[PDB]
Amino acid sequence: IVGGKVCPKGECPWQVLLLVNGAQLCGGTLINTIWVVSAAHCFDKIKNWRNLIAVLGEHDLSEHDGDEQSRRVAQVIIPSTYVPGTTNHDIALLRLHQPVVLTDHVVPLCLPERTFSERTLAFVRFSLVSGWGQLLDRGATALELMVLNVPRLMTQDCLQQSRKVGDSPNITEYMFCAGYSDGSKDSCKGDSGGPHATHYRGTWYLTGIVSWGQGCATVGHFGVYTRVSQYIEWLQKLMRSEPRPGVLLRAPFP
């Protein structure tokens, strides 16, 4: 996170830490006890498929305070339409091998239904963004979970207020922009997959997956997030499907 604050222990309970071969990989979002939502791009150059661990209740990467729980991931499902190295459809669904236990420091974020998100949650300005990513472009990673509040933007605005970079990948209907254009705050490499949660009438919902941007907190560029609302029923259909053997699964979208 660039320009955020350390989230206090327990106030970002749906934050998951993805580890591959023991190393820190990406963030995620607990959606219930067995599933977590992440970004498809974290798995692009992953070779060790059965060496994927999901850690919850985590806060400080430099200590084990017995609040953290880890499970191995049995399945990562990405849309067949996603093309590695690119930008579109950057979403992944992981089936935890064993269900974690909801505790004071382990609670899932609510995955809303398409219309509530599309017509209601889409209009609350600020939403939270968190993770253990770089504290600035190419800078170091954080040890304690970091949070950031960022204002959402309609794509037309996002396009109207950004420096016209002739190589920038188009912002599709599967993503939305959010953050600041003055280079002060933004998600950053290492946070991908993490949650963008919107608060509404006493409850928190999953509205976006940290996905991409032109370098962290660049002037004239907002961070772009995966539009989770477009994948609600796809997410639902998959959570109802029997475990198709093999860890990776490129399910058809939709």
């Binding site: 209009f123 609350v124 300005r125 600020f126 204002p151 309609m154 794509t155 037309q156 605005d157 209907e173």
Partner: protein, 195 residues
């Protein structure tokens, strides 16, 4: 398909704020949204075929705040939209035309009173007057003739001018907000003369 709205204009007088825009709907309907620079967007005028939206009840919750609005176009069979210029009520809302409440002759001095025209700002169901809203920022300006054209200024609603005990003077006032540089003066009221 649709066509994005355009020429979104704010029209405001005594806080009755109404957003207008073009064009006239032809196989499309509109929806408007309002918000302060950093607040959640509130939808008003749902699927309206009209080219205007009454935003008074929203803007009068804090007249000193700055609001931006947008107008969406939906096909009548993210959508297109256009943002409105920004509008800070307190500094841009038009001061209606004033109204001389009376003009009592006290000896050689004559007292002219301007009535506090009601604004749309409410408080406990009641409507605050222009003076409860602007306070010391509101200056009323009196014009009076006997061939002549004299003026006077007051930071209340009453004037006391020296009339030549010999003729029937005439009046007309103007509300002025000195601090402004935009819509700082109102249209002159209807002329009132002593019979």
């Amino acid at each position: 398909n649709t066509v994005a709205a355009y020429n979104l204009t704010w029209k405001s007088t005594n806080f009755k704020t109404i957003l207008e825009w073009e064009p006239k709907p032809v196989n499309q309907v509109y929806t408007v949204q309002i918000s302060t620079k950093s607040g959640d967007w509130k939808s008003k005028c749902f699927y309206t075929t009209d080219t205007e939206c009454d935003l008074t009840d929203e803007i009068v919750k804090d007249v000193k705040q700055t609001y931006l609005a947008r107008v969406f176009s939906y096909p009548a069979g993210e959508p297109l939209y256009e943002n409105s210029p920004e509008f800070t009520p307190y500094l841009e809302t038009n001061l209606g035309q004033p109204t001389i409440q009376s003009f009592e002759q006290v000896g050689t001095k004559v007292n002219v009173t301007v009535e506090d025209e009601r604004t749309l700002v409410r408080r406990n169901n009641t409507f605050l007057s222009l003076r409860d809203v602007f306070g010391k920022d509101l200056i009323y300006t009196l014009y009076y003739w006997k061939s002549g054209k004299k003026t006077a200024k007051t930071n209340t609603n009453e004037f006391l001018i020296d009339v030549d005990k010999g003729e029937n003077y005439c009046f007309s006032v103007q509300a002025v907000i000195p601090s402004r540089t935009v819509n700082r003066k109102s249209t002159d009221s209807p002329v009132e003369c002593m019979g």
